[PDB]
Amino acid sequence: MKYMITSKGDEKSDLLRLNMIAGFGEYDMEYDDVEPEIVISIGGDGTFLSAFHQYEERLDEIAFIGIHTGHLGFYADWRPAEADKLVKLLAKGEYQKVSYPLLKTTVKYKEATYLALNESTVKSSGGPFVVDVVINDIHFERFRGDGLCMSTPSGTTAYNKSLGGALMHPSIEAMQLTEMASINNRVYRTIGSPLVFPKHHVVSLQPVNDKDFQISVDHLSILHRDVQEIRYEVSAKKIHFARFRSFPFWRRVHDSFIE
Amino acid sequence: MKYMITSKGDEKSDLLRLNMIAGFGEYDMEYDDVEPEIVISIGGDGTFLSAFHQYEERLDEIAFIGIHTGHLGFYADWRPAEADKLVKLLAKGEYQKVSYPLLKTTVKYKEATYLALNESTVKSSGGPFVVDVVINDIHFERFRGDGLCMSTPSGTTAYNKSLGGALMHPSIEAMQLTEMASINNRVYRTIGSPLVFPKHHVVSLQPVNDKDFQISVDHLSILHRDVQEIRYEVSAKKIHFARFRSFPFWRRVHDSFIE
Amino acid sequence: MKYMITSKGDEKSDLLRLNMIAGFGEYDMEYDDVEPEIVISIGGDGTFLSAFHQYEERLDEIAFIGIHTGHLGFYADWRPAEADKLVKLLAKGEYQKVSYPLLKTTVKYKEATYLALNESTVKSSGGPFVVDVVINDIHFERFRGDGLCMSTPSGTTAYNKSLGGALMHPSIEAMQLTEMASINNRVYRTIGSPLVFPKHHVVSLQPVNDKDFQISVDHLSILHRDVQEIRYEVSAKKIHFARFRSFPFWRRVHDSFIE
Amino acid sequence: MKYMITSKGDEKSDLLRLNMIAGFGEYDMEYDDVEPEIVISIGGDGTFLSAFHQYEERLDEIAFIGIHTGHLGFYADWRPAEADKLVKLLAKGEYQKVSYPLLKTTVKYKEATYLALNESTVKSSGGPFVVDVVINDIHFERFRGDGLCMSTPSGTTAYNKSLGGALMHPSIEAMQLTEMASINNRVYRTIGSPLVFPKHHVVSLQPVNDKDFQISVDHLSILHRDVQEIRYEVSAKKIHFARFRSFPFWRRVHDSFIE
Numbered sequence A, B, C, D: 001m002k003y004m005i006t007s008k009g010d011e012k013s014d015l016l017r018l019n020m021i022a023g024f025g026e027y028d029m030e031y032d033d034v035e036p037e038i039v040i041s042i043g044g045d046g047t048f049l050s051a052f053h054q055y056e057e058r059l060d061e062i063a064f065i066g067i068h069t070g071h072l073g074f075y076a077d078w079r080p081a082e083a084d085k086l087v088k089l090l091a092k093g094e095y096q097k098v099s100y101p102l103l104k105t106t107v108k109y110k111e112a113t114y115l116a117l118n119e120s121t122v123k124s125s126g127g128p129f130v131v132d133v134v135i136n137d138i139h140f141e142r143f144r145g146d147g148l149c150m151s152t153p154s155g156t157t158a159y160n161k162s163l164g165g166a167l168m169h170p171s172i173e174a175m176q177l178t179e180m181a182s183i184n185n186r187v188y189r190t191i192g193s194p195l196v197f198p199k200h201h202v203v204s205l206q207p208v209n210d211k212d213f214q215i216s217v218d219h220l221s222i223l224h225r226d227v228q229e230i231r232y233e234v235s236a237k238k239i240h241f242a243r244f245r246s247f248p249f250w251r252r253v254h255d256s257f258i259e
């Protein structure tokens, strides 16, 4: 079945890529990097992120797999040594799909939308960052700090985690807002805690004075000018993973942070 | 319809209780404190917690209402002044039910189960608190600290919040584990972050040496002796609230912590 | 005695400035904004910061006073209403000096030094921020995160505080390092806690790959290119405040954050 | 010179103790466990703490040494293998003393004082912990939470650290107050940050309703009844360490938490 493979582009990963394509040739898997059904990423979670964004308009039609040739990532949860086995099962099919939820960011000025697999962050360009925070059309706080991070479930082990966010199991359809260094006094008062929103809640940010912001989607950082609204909601689209064995998420969490 | 009313027992709340019963008499609402269908709590969230536990084996059959005669609580979200209106709508019916998820704690030695509306905490009796933490039969960390807090969604604004937990919207069926003062070194290593578990995940705690613990369920604190396991999971039972108007949770969060 | 007065430049503060100069004329206080002995700042702590930096090469020879025409600052701890009294005592002299410690930042490429009254921060320009941290020539950690904040004692109620830093009483001659969003895994491991250094300790930062950084001294933000070292130490210079009455620091802390 | 040696009392440490005494016999060091001049502790920091408290009325007259037969402690910073060298230099003298500051806790009801090397903590007995906090006779906050920890400089790597306290270099004469799980709302408002006090500041705690508390001094936990005041200040007494080589504190910090 159609397939494509992306590489971190160092020596170790380019080699492993050519050996996989050859093994795929020993079945009749048609390489197509235009309409693949299976997208294999080789290197690190960053490489995987790029694989996801390279194909984010065909999400409902692709199964992604991560192979970490550096250290384990959360998306790249295959060692190189397991490559030949991968190719094998990947050919026979009879594999299962798991879907993780995604984050839609909408930026009104026209109107542009982004899909994040880790998180969408907002900071200020130059001046201090001051936005009013609106939850389902309800004014909640006036945030003054360094910025805000909206994380997916699988993104909570990433940036979110470093911001003191909670770690969330990916089957939960939600989004998590973490503060970045809010000032807090009788004047300026924010909630502090990470907030965790369900499906269909719209978290909307509204600027007070400066209208320019730096928006980051999975480490891509766009500068946006003359901003009127940023809207976060849990996306309707989901990413699909090819699952060949049990690698529970909490097991994955353990190996990356405890031992 | 059958009903009962609980009081904080200070002067302000006992009065408001008698005036509500009289107004109920002006309809024909039968007071029954043995099999009520509607349980009204008057005072603070503590009073409400007690109302919930007084009737925790008939949860599937009761709608609770909170009236705060002190400061707003999260469960007691009615001012006294609105009492006469309450009685009124409470009589005609045609009100809606909202259900919040609950937490089951199971303590094996026989075996005892508890239902929490805020959270179930564990501390040590005397000695240091050391348990191994097991997630769906997966050894995750060996925790050494002051203790652990497992919070419901609606409990995340309570103890959980003070432990740096995330605030969670109550429609989300989950449970949140917050650490209490873990020691962290090359020897002892815990995750740090609040962890947030879905339905059907069982978080199980297993003692290393000392076997005695102080377990707290909604501020009730039992000492347990010769403990073999503590098991947390999202309960199948839910609590039901009578809803007469919109008081969104995030609105409720705003009023209690921001302004 | 020679004196000068700086203004936030809104209407309220310019007026108060002219009325003070007139009152000074009713004594014979020579206005000199080139070699003042007394520097009065009118507006907010920001205005005061600017007053300090406008005269940072004559620190050993100036007493600063803050008047807050907005909300109380930590440096601007005089209400406008007290202005006429201020002028009065300011004329007779017989006032006491308090000195707060300062922070020297040294940036080697030539070599440039900065004096901070609040803090010196470092972030990355574009890429991720990765420096090795060296304490008295001892390699301590390899920090990978958003950045680092080195705060003075009186600066600990400022940025430092929002970064989870400790609040420090200003008579203590020290400097405090707070992390900004470190990544932590088996690979990358930082201390986490705020660190608090004494006099004569040199905290030195050393870049790993990217050599460009954004350095902030009291909210002035310079971009520095081809950086070889950043060195923090407690400065030998001190700032002097004119003290006319008791306004203890902890009292000051209480009014700004508790009530 | 007079000397004594304390043991964790497991097999490894009792042996090492007898071999040191024999080596001391090969000089003429008089063993005296009543008036030693040198107190050697063998095991872990806990063992060392006990050695300190066993001799806390002769502090101005004893040099302590720690040997860790488990893992390195902060006070037990000698490996067993270095024992014979220790004995040697310990005999010739010509060693240097370093002194770390200590914490005095005063508990008025009569009046009892305690000396801590790590920290003095306060919790409640049964009920919720509510004290007013007074700094040099200035009412600062009304704390409602799980408790409070007052840490020495060298204690900041201990409990203090787990409470989010800052790590402090021991030459700094100060004390650090960390909160334990304060509730924070418009009603109850505490500072949050660790506070760091200098010499001569008296931090005094005053109970609101319940008067019983559990006070912990270096993990000794006394229950105190009918309490009127707890007073913390930096002690006039200091502990003295025998220093035979450079083991800088920050180096010590690195080895225990980073690598």
Ligand SMILES: CN(CC#Cc1nc2c(N)ncnc2n1[C@@H]1O[C@H](CNC(=O)Nc2ccccc2)[C@@H](O)[C@H]1O)C[C@H]1O[C@@H](n2cnc3c(N)ncnc32)[C@H](O)[C@@H]1O
Pocket: A044, A045, A046, A049, A072, A073, A074, A075, A118, A119, A154, A155, A156, A157, A158, A159, A160, A162, A217, A218, A219, C128, C129, C144, C145, C146, C180, C181, C182, C183
């Ligand atoms: C360039 N990245 C690729 C990714 C990813 C990533 N996904 C996840 C995930 N789902 N769950 C768990 N771990 C993850 N990883 C891991 O992170 C390290 C890779 N990347 C960073 O090292 N980046 C970085 C950025 C700035 C400062 C310091 C570090 C590896 O171990 C990966 O496996 C982008 C991602 O960087 C995160 N990010 C941004 N700022 C961060 C910060 N201050 N602290 C921690 N993370 C931060 C964020 O999520 C962004 O999308």
Ligand SMILES: CN(CC#Cc1nc2c(N)ncnc2n1[C@@H]1O[C@H](CNC(=O)Nc2ccccc2)[C@@H](O)[C@H]1O)C[C@H]1O[C@@H](n2cnc3c(N)ncnc32)[C@H](O)[C@@H]1O
Pocket: B044, B045, B046, B049, B072, B073, B074, B075, B118, B119, B154, B155, B156, B157, B158, B159, B160, B162, B217, B218, B219, D128, D129, D144, D145, D146, D180, D181, D182, D183
């Ligand atoms: C006796 N309580 C009754 C309750 C509740 C309660 N529910 C919630 C909730 N769903 N969401 C938001 N707020 C809540 N409230 C609010 O809390 C204050 C009432 N109670 C406390 O003041 N108790 C306390 C206990 C120890 C130390 C300091 C304070 C009011 O404002 C209520 O409206 C029991 C609950 O106490 C929580 N608890 C325990 N230790 C805590 C700590 N260290 N910090 C913060 N909370 C702590 C916990 O959830 C326990 O079940």
Ligand SMILES: CN(CC#Cc1nc2c(N)ncnc2n1[C@@H]1O[C@H](CNC(=O)Nc2ccccc2)[C@@H](O)[C@H]1O)C[C@H]1O[C@@H](n2cnc3c(N)ncnc32)[C@H](O)[C@@H]1O
Pocket: A128, A129, A144, A145, A146, A180, A181, A182, A183, C044, C045, C046, C049, C072, C073, C074, C075, C118, C119, C154, C155, C156, C157, C158, C159, C160, C162, C217, C218, C219
């Ligand atoms: C432009 N400032 C002037 C100052 C100062 C200042 N000194 C102190 C101090 N000794 N002790 C206590 N409070 C202080 N203030 C108070 O701070 C508010 C003023 N300024 C900010 O609002 N600035 C800001 C910046 C970015 C994002 C949000 C807020 C008033 O109330 C002042 O009285 C510069 C100072 O901004 C601090 N800063 C930077 N980033 C921060 C952040 N994320 N959170 C909190 N502070 C941050 C930092 O110290 C910088 O030097």
Ligand SMILES: CN(CC#Cc1nc2c(N)ncnc2n1[C@@H]1O[C@H](CNC(=O)Nc2ccccc2)[C@@H](O)[C@H]1O)C[C@H]1O[C@@H](n2cnc3c(N)ncnc32)[C@H](O)[C@@H]1O
Pocket: B128, B129, B144, B145, B146, B180, B181, B182, B183, D044, D045, D046, D049, D072, D073, D074, D075, D118, D119, D154, D155, D156, D157, D158, D159, D160, D162, D217, D218, D219
């Ligand atoms: C019985 N101890 C002896 C001691 C000490 C000690 N001194 C220091 C120090 N100057 N600097 C750095 N590390 C230190 N150590 C290290 O701590 C571990 C030993 N002890 C604990 O494991 N005790 C414990 C208690 C409750 C829950 C979990 C752990 C070793 O590695 C030692 O080398 C008493 C000390 O226990 C601290 N303590 C209390 N509660 C704590 C908590 N929740 N988290 C972290 N520490 C906590 C506190 O300072 C008390 O005095």
